[PDB]
Design a protein around this ligand. Structure first.
Ligand SMILES: CN1C(=O)c2ccccc2NC(=O)[C@@H]1Cc1ccccc1
Ligand SMILES: CN1C(=O)c2ccccc2NC(=O)[C@@H]1Cc1ccccc1
Ligand SMILES: O=C(O)CCC(=O)C(=O)O
Ligand SMILES: O=C(O)CCC(=O)C(=O)O
Ligand code: NI
Ligand code: NI
Lengths: 288, 288
């Protein structure tokens, strides 16, 4: 069985989305530089350490799907300069997203999260993303272009033994799911900064951590059309942080109005014919 | 040809959604009391008068679809006490919406707007709503439950001669649109406070104002699943106004997290497993 296609962020940029459209997955080598990875890791470190279990009794939106050996930290903009500057303005990310979502219009971040898996973390069940938040997605016709995609960026090594993600190539086009098996999977073996890119229809799962010693960490960026509601809110992010961002990053975080691709688009999140940013006189690129 | 079914808000409440599901439209008689209509009208009056043309050159999200004799004012919560208290907490509205959207989960306001049509306003072309903002909707399978519905509430009389809305009954189930004609329509003749309820697949249009003297006004409330992005933003609504609302009204305006109907729903607009309202310590029902 064929392995996940591997592509250069630098040279193969126009090939990335076509590859995912065909195969349902691709590895983007050096999606983030080691410097960006180092900074992201340093900045999110304490927030990962303080994060409780996904279904902690203190939470009013517990996540009952993730294992108790998973820590997931979302709403990264207030935590990480590297995320809100380097990642949210990634030229590679934006080329891919505009390639993927042009039929629909603007896209934004549905969720940007760091996931850390403790040693001995079990494999997740094979799944498609979005089914525990956006039931609407299952009602889309089979030829509807993907309405979200997920960049699973390695922040530490992904190896067979430490639970590198499994994907089923071609499963984004499956309607009948009787052949869903771990027998059908291949692995996303990755170095820090590489990214596994999948669609919302790609069947995949986190792997089993079998060493008992290694802690695997990733940055998962679910990018989706601006017509779909994010899993996470940036409503509580301080205004000085928002005003430090680029206009593009502000839009990605829901601090701007949005547009569809409809010829005479009437817009999303507008205020009596004007944008959020015009109405609220939102500054951009103001240093902290 | 059969007329639009007319139902009592008081007595026929459980019948309203089934009627719309079958026929694509229903008139809800006395949906709003005359007192609520009077207050809404008084409160929005000046904002309608100052509103420019839909595609005014001053706007960065011009609406190129509506006629130059249309004034549309959305983001009503800061303008109208009647809207944000009486309308957003309407028992009838909420029964209907929970009937309609239970398959998907929570619902919210995609747009609440007052539309005023000047004398001599022409008929709109026959259309389905949502196509100039949410192209995703056209990609839904035919048996997907409606993901949005629109309450067109009369704030003045709707007569044949003054441009009462046209609908095509049963057109919410049409796939082939070759028989779309004004020949196929019936009229929503309504008194102030009555509401025409349609789905996002019901083919309809504003009628021609033929008197040259009458000014028709309506309150259009597009309610949709919380998985779809609103056409309008309440991000700039003052915190004291938001904190005066019920928790339900806050959710409807995007000042709360949201839930899907998925068995182990992980939520929408959450912040590291907690809600917007818990995170921001958002008060409710605090008088102004
Ligand atoms: C539930 N779930 C997440 O929490 C998740 C986490 C990170 C990024 C995307 C994401 N979206 C999802 O739909 C997944 C789905 C899932 C996960 C584990 C086991 C079964 C299903
Ligand atoms: C464009 N458009 C609005 O502006 C509108 C106004 C009020 C409530 C819903 C609404 N949604 C829409 O999709 C309509 C569609 C339309 C209107 C006129 C002519 C052609 C198409
Ligand atoms: O752990 C991984 O590599 C994948 C995680 C995942 O697919 C998910 O949580 O949705
Ligand atoms: O004017 C009316 O009665 C209907 C308006 C309408 O359908 C629209 O603007 O989408
Ligand atoms: Ni997943
Ligand atoms: Ni309409």
């Amino acid at each position: 069985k064929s392995q996940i296609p591997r592509l250069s962020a630098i040279n193969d940029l126009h090939k990335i989305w076509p590859t995912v459209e065909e195969h349902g997955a691709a590895i983007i080598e050096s999606f983030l530089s080691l410097d960006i990875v180092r900074r992201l890791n340093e900045e999110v470190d304490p927030f990962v350490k303080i994060e409780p279990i996904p279904a902690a009794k203190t939470k009013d939106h517990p996540n009952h799907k993730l294992s108790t050996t998973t820590r997931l930290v979302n709403v990264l903009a207030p935590i990480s300069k590297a995320y809100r500057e380097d990642v949210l303005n990634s030229k590679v990310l934006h080329r891919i997203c505009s390639d993927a979502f042009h039929v629909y219009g603007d896209y934004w971040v549905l969720m940007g999260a760091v996931m850390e898996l403790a040693p001995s973390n079990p494999a997740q069940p094979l799944h498609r993303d979005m089914r525990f938040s956006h039931p609407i997605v299952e009602y889309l016709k089979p030829d509807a272009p993907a309405t979200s995609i997920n960049f699973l960026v390695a922040l530490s090594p992904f190896t067979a033994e430490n639970g590198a993600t499994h994907v089923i190539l071609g499963s984004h086009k499956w309607q009948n799911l009787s052949n869903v098996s771990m027998d059908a999977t291949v692995r996303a073996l990755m170095n820090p900064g590489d990214a596994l890119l999948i669609t919302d229809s790609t069947i995949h799962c986190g792997g089993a951590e079998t060493t008992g010693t290694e802690t695997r960490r990733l940055l998962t960026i679910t990018m989706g059309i601006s017509q779909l509601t994010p899993l996470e809110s940036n409503l509580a992010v301080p205004r000085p942080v928002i005003e430090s961002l680029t206009p593009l990053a502000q839009r990605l975080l829901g601090w701007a109005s949005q547009r569809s691709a409809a010829p005479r688009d009437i817009g999303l999140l507008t205020i009596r014919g004007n944008s959020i940013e015009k109405t609220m006189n939102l500054k951009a690129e103001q240093p902290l």
